[PDB]
Write a protein that binds this ligand. Structure first.
Ligand code: ZN
Lengths: 287, 50, 70, 286
């Protein structure tokens, strides 16, 4: 009768509702509630994520309106599907992820009212390059002071999916709460239709990018390649032959030998091949 | 070690690494590094001060 | 994955960020730079940047979070 | 006066969410909800949406019901939590639409003046077929035909802003198709760029074989709308010939002398170093 290793099943539209609401008010700590379904002991799912109307207080238990939620939940019973909340979320743009002074209290109020109520922290100012630092957490009780926390029993995936970094284990890990693993519920009827409407172009794959700027682009690159070739000429004729293998390894440039020599040459080669082949095909097709 | 700079972690304020060479910012004014500008015989007349 | 790695290093460095100044160099792939908001830092460099460009205390680029040489 | 719409991917999967919500007991095979919008100048943009319970009797195909109190509640909640997003129209699924969509639209134009609909395709997702949109127009028909509605089409697109693509890219993680490809993605772009061409040719081939073969009253509009394509395409002449070999020589010879010289000498320099490195360890192993 204890936890081992839970797994949070998030949906594709769940995280999309998380990023847009987090990006919406960035300097005002957006705050909403997480709605899912406890399917068994140690797997938990969430498909539908709604937001909450915020207040002057901010992320707290007071911004959670009870009469708005039950009015909202009742109207969701007839449209879509009725279910019970399984947690909450908030946004910490000022730092990474850890449970704040009042985040731990509203966690206690939710796991006393609901069952376990996993809290999700999303940093909207970090989800920028190609990755998101979304993490969820779960409070452990203070009664297990003589037993080691995270009662893992039959699992070896816990070394994966994140290790606790120095910016995480300073605030509350692992003595207050613990981390949890989250995977992505990918399936068909969602994934291929997202790709075919985002990264897909029908009329664009056969255009010609008319040759005012096209052959013009094949001229500014020849000059800088020539100077690199003359610089490549300068090093190859030079040929220091006193202690060569140490002089080569302590004096690297990472731009002379083959870095700036074939990079643009490859780019100019592929572009005119694509351009001429698309030019030849339309001459085969169009009369 | 006197005037020993160290790398401090910016989260827990823990030591990271003993740092190398001592405090010398703005040595661009220092160490002129160019030896020839003028010879000795182009002064003349002031040999006592020399 | 090698093409993912080139794209990763490309988009890691073309974002709005602060401008700092080179101060000193420890060794290969680690240097001592400080911001223009004071409070001298200690970060790593990227291997793209030519090492024969920071002898003086010249203006460099610093990330907001990693605060590394960009 | 709508140029084109550009709804995020948030409602796209949603409908499929709500279609997955109803499919346990639902025998309607269509999902009709309410589209939200933020009408800026002339281009349209959708961020959010919601659904509403809707059934339609297949007998007499003219009987529908919409819950407006649920519309008046949930929209007022959305404006309360987010005072940016407002009503712009509605949506349904299924390519074959039922003929009450005029009756849906004429009622809820008391909400939105420039009311607009978007059709998504939940089951067809194999060929190239994104979302589709119409516009609410009330004219006679053309000039000499009886009066009608004549749903006019507005072009569509799937835009994608910042701070959702990182949520998009991190959910893909399967092929991910990086930008400018190394000559193999571009050929596939021309393959399925042309697999969409003959598909439209085959589709319009089945159209002309049923537009006269005695089926329905031919549209005088579409008659000259097809005629100005065939005798307006360009042909070959002498001027096209002398110009093509002029610039094809120019577009080739650079790639000739860049590939055949620069890539060649590098491989020779790579030959020199390893054969020296092969013979230096060989002369000094023993
Ligand atoms: Zn918080």
């Amino acid at each position: 009768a204890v936890d081992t290793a839970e797994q949070v099943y998030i949906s594709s539209l769940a995280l999309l509702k998380m990023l847009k609401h987090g990006r919406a008010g960035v300097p005002m700590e957006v705050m909403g509630l997480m709605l899912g379904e406890f399917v068994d002991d140690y797997t938990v799912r969430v498909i539908d994520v709604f937001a909450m109307p915020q207040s002057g207080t901010g992320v707290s238990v007071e911004a959670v309106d009870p009469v708005f939620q039950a009015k909202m939940l009742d109207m969701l019973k007839q449209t879509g599907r009725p279910e019970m909340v399984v947690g909450w979320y908030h946004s910490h743009p000022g730092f990474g992820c850890w449970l704040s002074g009042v985040d731990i209290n509203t966690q206690q109020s939710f796991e006393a009212l609901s069952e376990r109520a996993v809290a999700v922290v999303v940093d909207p100012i970090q989800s920028v390059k190609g990755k998101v630092v979304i993490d969820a957490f779960r409070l452990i009780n203070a009664n297990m002071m003589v037993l080691g926390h995270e009662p893992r029993q039959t699992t070896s995936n816990l070394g994966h999916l994140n290790k606790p970094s120095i910016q995480a284990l300073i605030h509350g890990l692992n003595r207050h709460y613990y981390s949890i693993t989250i995977n992505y519920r990918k399936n068909e009827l969602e994934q291929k239709m997202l790709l075919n409407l985002h990264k897909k172009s029908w009329m664009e794959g056969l255009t010609l990018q008319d040759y005012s700027e096209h052959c013009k682009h094949n001229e500014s690159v020849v000059k800088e390649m020539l100077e690199l070739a003359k610089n490549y000429n300068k090093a190859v004729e030079e040929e220091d032959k006193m202690t060569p293998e140490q002089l080569a390894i302590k004096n690297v440039g990472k731009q002379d030998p083959k870095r700036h020599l074939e990079e643009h040459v490859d780019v100019l080669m592929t572009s005119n091949i694509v351009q001429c082949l698309a030019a030849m095909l339309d001459t085969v097709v169009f009369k | 070690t006197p005037n020993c700079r160290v790398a401090l972690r910016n989260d827990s304020y823990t030591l990271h690494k003993i740092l190398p060479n001592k405090v010398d910012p703005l040595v661009s004014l220092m160490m002129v590094e160019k030896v020839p500008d003028s010879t000795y015989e182009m002064i003349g007349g002031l040999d006592k001060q020399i | 994955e090698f093409l993912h790695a080139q794209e990763e290093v490309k988009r890691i460095q073309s974002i709005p960020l602060v401008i700092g100044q080179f101060l000193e160099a420890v060794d290969q792939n680690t240097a001592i730079v400080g911001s223009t908001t004071g409070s001298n830092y200690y970060v790593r460099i990227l291997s793209t940047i030519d090492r024969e460009l920071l002898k003086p205390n010249a203006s460099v680029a610093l990330h907001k979070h990693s605060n590394a040489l960009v | 006066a709508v140029q084109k719409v550009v709804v995020h991917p948030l409602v796209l999967l949603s409908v499929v969410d709500h279609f997955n919500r109803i499919g346990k007991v639902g025998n309607q095979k269509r999902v009709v909800g309410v589209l939200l919008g933020s009408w800026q100048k002339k281009v349209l943009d959708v961020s959010n949406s919601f659904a509403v319970p809707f059934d339609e009797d297949d007998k007499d195909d003219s009987v529908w019901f919409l819950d407006h109190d649920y519309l008046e509640n949930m929209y007022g909640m959305f404006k309360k939590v987010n005072a940016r997003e407002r009503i712009v129209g509605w949506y349904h699924t299924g390519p074959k639409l039922h003929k009450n969509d005029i009756a849906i639209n004429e009622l809820m134009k008391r909400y939105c003046p420039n009311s607009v609909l978007v059709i998504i395709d939940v089951k067809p997702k194999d060929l190239g077929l994104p979302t589709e949109a119409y516009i609410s127009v009330e004219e006679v028909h053309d000039d000499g035909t009886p009066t009608s509605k004549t749903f006019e089409h507005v072009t569509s697109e799937i835009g994608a802003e910042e701070a959702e693509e990182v949520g998009v890219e991190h959910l893909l993680r399967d092929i991910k198709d990086t930008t400018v490809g190394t000559l193999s993605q571009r050929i596939t772009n021309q393959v399925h760029g042309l697999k969409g061409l003959n598909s439209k040719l085959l589709d319009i081939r089945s159209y002309l074989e049923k537009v006269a073969t005695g089926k329905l009253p031919i549209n005088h509009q579409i008659i000259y709308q097809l005629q100005d394509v065939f005798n307006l395409l360009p042909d070959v002449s002498l001027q096209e010939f002398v110009k093509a070999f002029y610039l094809k020589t120019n577009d080739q010879m650079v790639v000739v002398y860049l590939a055949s010289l620069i890539r060649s000498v590098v491989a020779l320099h790579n030959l020199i170093n390893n054969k020296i490195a092969n013979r230096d360890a060989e002369k000094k192993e023993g």
